[PDB]
């Protein structure tokens, strides 16, 4: 019964944002699963709406996040996000939000997949938004092959990230890779440093790691480099 004034308002005037907000506020007083079915019906009617998808996923996450970590209801919200990615296209907000929400679930496998699908979906400009979160995500795991491939991509946009990659290789004990990159950097004298380090100091740091570690460093003619 009580749906029918708002249903008539919405079906006669689908572009009336005020009529949508009126019914959403009405459903906020109602029990919230019917609001989710409203959003299901609303997105069937108006999938291109930025406002409908953003509010739905915000409401979905805020309800579910208090539940048990293993609860299937999180996968329902995920299925909404999958559908959200389909309609919304260029709008950055959902791409960021879903990856963050899967980190809250600890779903490492699916978080990477959503990053990898975001990179596949969108231009390099959108990638530049993705990579700060994704590299910060990749560092937090013992997944060095994935982080190596991710770090490499950023370097031709961000030279300062090569310092972060060398520091990542140092902390991952991948000193042989770190020696290869830093020797390339020391030859690439146009390099830019967040510490402002000189090319002599970078070469010094190169020799600091190398002279400590003849065993680990193996791809390089150490004698030639120091001569």
């Amino acid at each position: 019964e009580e749906d029918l004034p708002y249903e008539e308002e919405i079906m006669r005037n689908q572009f009336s944002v005020k009529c949508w907000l009126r019914y959403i506020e009405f459903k906020q007083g109602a029990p919230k699963p019917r609001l989710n079915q409203l959003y299901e019906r609303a997105l069937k009617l108006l999938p291109c709406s930025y406002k409908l998808w953003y509010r739905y996923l915000k409401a979905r996450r805020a309800q579910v996040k208090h539940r048990c970590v293993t609860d299937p209801a999180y996968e329902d919200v995920n299925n909404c996000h999958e559908r959200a990615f389909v309609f919304m296209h260029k709008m950055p907000r959902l791409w960021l939000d879903y990856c963050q929400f899967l980190m809250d679930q600890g779903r490492v496998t699916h978080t990477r997949r959503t990053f990898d699908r975001a990179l596949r979906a969108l231009p390099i400009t959108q990638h530049s938004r993705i990579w700060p979160l994704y590299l910060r995500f990749l560092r937090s795991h013992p997944l060095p092959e994935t982080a190596v491939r991710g770090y490499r991509r950023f370097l031709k946009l961000s030279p300062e990230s090569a310092e972060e990659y060398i520091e990542y290789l140092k902390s991952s004990d991948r000193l042989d890779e770190a020696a290869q990159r830093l020797a390339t950097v020391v030859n690439d004298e146009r390099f830019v440093s967040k510490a402002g380090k000189s090319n002599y100091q970078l070469w010094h740091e190169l020799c600091d790691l190398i002279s400590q570690n003849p065993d680990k460093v193996q791809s390089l003619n150490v004698d030639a480099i120091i001569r």
């Binding site: 002279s211 400590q212 003849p214 065993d215």
Partner: peptide
Amino acid sequence: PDYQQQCHEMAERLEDSVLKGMQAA
């Protein structure tokens, strides 16, 4: 000093080098 900085750094590093060197040899 620039010169003495390398003196203090390598003095500690040589002892580490001798320790790891005897292990490798």
